């Protein structure tokens, strides 16, 4: 989507493996706030918005 009309995907009821994304060589930016990127696989969330 265009940034003015950005898309929101609601993610729930699933297993989230974030190390697949973090350990990828394909991303130029991967900045986490309020959470460590290396602790994500140990955490549970009520919901994730992408």
């Amino acid at each position: 989507a265009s940034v003015y009309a950005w898309n929101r995907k609601r993610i729930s009821n699933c297993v989230a493996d974030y190390s697949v994304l973090y350990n990828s060589a394909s991303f130029s930016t991967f900045k986490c706030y309020g959470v460590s990127p290396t602790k994500l696989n140990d955490l549970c969330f009520t919901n994730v918005y992408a």
Partner: protein, 49 residues
Amino acid sequence: SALGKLQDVVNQNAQALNTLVKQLSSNFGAISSVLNDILSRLDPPEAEV
């Protein structure tokens, strides 16, 4: 109420302890009042703050 003088001492101290315990639920500006939640989420450089 005859023994109010002794009950007052009990009440004041019980209240002081209850207040002290309840303060553990305060964030004090932190992301969480729960120390374990901070430690499980953040790395040391940020957790320490």
